[PDB]
Symmetry: C2
Subunit: 487 residues, 2 copies
């Protein structure tokens, strides 16, 4: 079978996808997110492992076949979260920073300033955007537990979620990572995919606790046991949610583009083997195509998206449930200038805002009780529009009927109020969570389970496009709001 497991940020979803693109489980658990002072959000490794176990072994709902035929494992874990654990005492005495809280601003700003600030960006593409894993580490391993000297002798070996789940999965393993997530961690690099020492040696310790990385289909078993081969069933995938979605959605050819609006609005393309970067405030990333090999591509720079939606329900309830967007909200015309950019800690986009926390905007009396709700629906799609519109202006590659998916993306209406200004169609792949399948496939590419990428092509469904509407000759009229009331 295929154990297409997902993780989002904590939202443990996905199950044992029964080979032929089918389902047999209802794994959906969103653990209680915490919001400390200001925006110092960070869920302890405890919450990570406790939830992961529920999906891993828990995925056995209907198709509970023993290790004798499961396989096809492809962990679609989260990404950028740098967790730690104490090897000597054997018990983790700390928390885990999250990729959605710019709690790094306190310190990172005093070190950049001079030339080296742009140094990384003007050449690579990425930029030290505070919450970028490595940068966050410069604070973590200091205030929490006084033992600087101990940090020299390993002590609390650091590593991303990948290096975490694997390490303490069953017990015994090596600090592994993967290319896809690697670049994001900033310790590695897109134009390197290897362990860049030199600069990194500035994180209090000279790269002492260096995580390992994996290249292609890391189809591998474990170190659990106790003199017996147990909880040592095969595996792969081991990649970030958004990264798995990238190649998973049949993206194995030129010009293949997608979209996945959920906790984050990440769009990735397929530029063959060209590590390029869009000088217009855009980042860099990797991709896949043709045969089982790593390609290169660009992405969209977003901090968060579906956070605004998860926010009100756990505060300004009102409507109780978030899916209301599909129901009592449709005939409500549209947002109407209230562009509430999901700014919990910083904004994101080409503008970043390393100090701006919170962004109400849309100062209009319309903001009554049930008003705030639809604001996010509109905003998220438009947030995608921000990078989309600017992208064509440089690359020149026009975007066709792109593929879209995601838990939050389930709102049919979201597709309509998005493609509008772009004047084109979109097609949602016949699969609510196609993301899980991507990383999952990377297990069969070893034991001769899967021949090669060229096979799935014959089975697809693209008859899910929305009919273009006549009313639109003005579109950018709203667009102007992006160039107003925000700075």
């Amino acid at each position: 079978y295929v154990m297409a497991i997902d993780q989002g940020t904590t939202s443990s979803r996905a199950i044992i996808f029964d080979r032929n693109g089918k389902k047999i489980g209802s794994s959906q658990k969103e653990f209680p997110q915490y919001f400390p002072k200001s925006g110092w959000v960070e869920h302890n490794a405890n919450e990570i492992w406790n939830s992961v176990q529920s999906v891993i072994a828990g995925a056995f709902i209907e198709s509970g076949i023993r290790p004798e035929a499961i396989a096809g494992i492809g962990i679609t874990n989260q990404r950028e979260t740098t967790v730690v654990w104490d090897k000597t005492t054997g018990q983790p005495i700390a928390n885990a920073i999250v990729w959605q809280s710019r709690q790094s601003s306190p310190i990172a700003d005093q070190l950049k300033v001079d030339g080296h600030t742009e140094m990384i960006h003007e050449k690579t593409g990425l930029v030290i955007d505070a919450y970028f894993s490595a940068t966050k580490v410069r604070w973590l391993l200091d205030n929490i537990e006084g033992a600087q000297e101990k940090a020299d002798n390993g002590e609390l070996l650091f590593g991303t979620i990948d290096s975490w789940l694997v390490w303490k999965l069953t017990d015994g393993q090596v600090h592994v990572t993967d290319y896809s997530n690697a670049s994001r961690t900033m310790l590695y690099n897109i134009h390197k995919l290897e362990w860049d020492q030199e600069i990194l040696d500035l994180l209090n310790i000279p790269s002492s606790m260096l995580p390992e990385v994996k290249s292609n289909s890391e189809v591998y078993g474990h170190t659990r046991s106790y003199h017996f081969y147990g909880s040592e069933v095969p595996i792969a995938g081991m990649a970030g949610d958004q990264q798995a979605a990238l190649f998973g959605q049949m993206a194995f050819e030129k010009g293949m583009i997608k979209n996945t609006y959920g906790t984050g609005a990440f769009i990735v393309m397929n530029t063959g083997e060209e590590p390029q970067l869009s000088d217009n405030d855009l980042l860099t990333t990797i991709g896949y195509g043709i045969n089982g090999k790593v390609y290169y591509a660009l992405e969209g720079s977003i901090f968060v998206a579906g956070s605004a939606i998860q926010w009100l329900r756990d505060g300004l309830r009102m409507i109780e449930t978030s899916p209301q967007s599909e129901e009592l909200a449709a005939k409500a015309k549209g947002d109407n200038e209230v562009y509430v950019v999901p700014a919990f800690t910083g904004l994101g986009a080409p503008y970043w805002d390393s100090e701006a926390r919170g962004a109400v905007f849309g100062l209009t009396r319309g903001t009554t009780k049930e008003d705030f709700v639809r604001a996010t629906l509109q905003a998220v799609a438009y947030q995608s529009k921000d990078v989309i519109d600017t992208m064509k202006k440089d690359s020149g590659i026009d975007i066709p009927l792109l593929k879209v998916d995601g838990g939050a993306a389930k709102n049919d209406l979201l597709m309509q109020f998005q493609a509008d200004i772009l004047d084109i169609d979109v097609q949602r792949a016949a699969n609510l969570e196609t993301t899980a399948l991507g990383a999952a496939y990377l297990a069969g590419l070893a034991v001769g389970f899967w021949k090669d990428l060229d096979e799935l092509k014959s089975m697809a469904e693209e008859g899910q496009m929305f009919t273009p509407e006549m009313p639109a000759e003005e579109r950018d009229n709203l667009y102007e709001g992006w160039k107003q009331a925000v700075a």
Copy 2:
């Protein structure tokens, strides 16, 4: 460190142990008691299982350290609960008909009035009641289409709740059923300690694929390949939880009684070496003491006596948010003529006869429409009396010393109510859900560790014996009302 866990009830939490003997509280994990309809509680096993999955390994997070310095892990689970698989294939024939169920009654027609039941009173020591695991199995057996052919071939397999918990852990190479579930399982004659092949012939039931009488007090796990594990991991057996509670307290000496609640009302105690078949309703089940051997005991528990939060919340939505129970449903008076007899799906209790439909009856006039809180609460005492009193009157020797260690009553009302209503102060403890606690102390004895007991109970600081008070002598009023309002 050491690990002991519960399963079923309402919350399959996990309670991890530490150095010497310390419990790091309970984690907070819960999953609804999934049920189809009516008394046909075909409760999905995988549902309650998913919660248990993290409980197996993820729960370790409390103590911090993982499976690399552990001991015997004792398991307590809801008894009965038949579950049938496809030999080694995870895909069940249907699902699990849990301990709380009644649907075999109308089927047992061609059995009860056939004379071949009188011996059951001396052999297994039972009476005519649908509340018997074996009957539920025989029910499902004589229910599924063409299941007869599927039987002989070797496709379907006989089993109960005891297997699954271990099954998924073993790797699927285990089919156990601890002797503890005998008696309740009609086809598990206590006088024989083994399955009764006799009746099987009546329905042409194979005497082949039957579970194995396993252990509870020590490691085990399960084998697939020779030696191996297969995700096996050292397990430390299983046992019916609201039976095991008998051992959770020193109900060994002739002068100590206990009381389990769990989800409703479960009273049981060790009787002695020889089958004391005292015609008084209470049936005979397996029980032991210092010497972990097969001995005799009396029991005749009830499905539930008044599941407050459950029905009040998910049923009437009166208390809304669970905390609100003790918060409001225990302050200014209560009950008043109200006599609600628990018997939604099944009856149980000395009534036995399912025909006695229990529900809300003795309602007073002038009661505001929104009047439902002190129902189940007050009702508990009335039913608990019908089971605890019978036990005392059976033996003759009335014992004032009733201590509770079955949790459930988180609302202090029971202590500050149930006590004076019967004058005997039902004494509490610190750790409410002692049922799970007593699980790890079992496995330890075999491994020496604590050697026996003596000091181990140095944490049973009950504070003070709640002194019985004068304002209680008036309760017989409603008692002589209850002994009439029910038919």
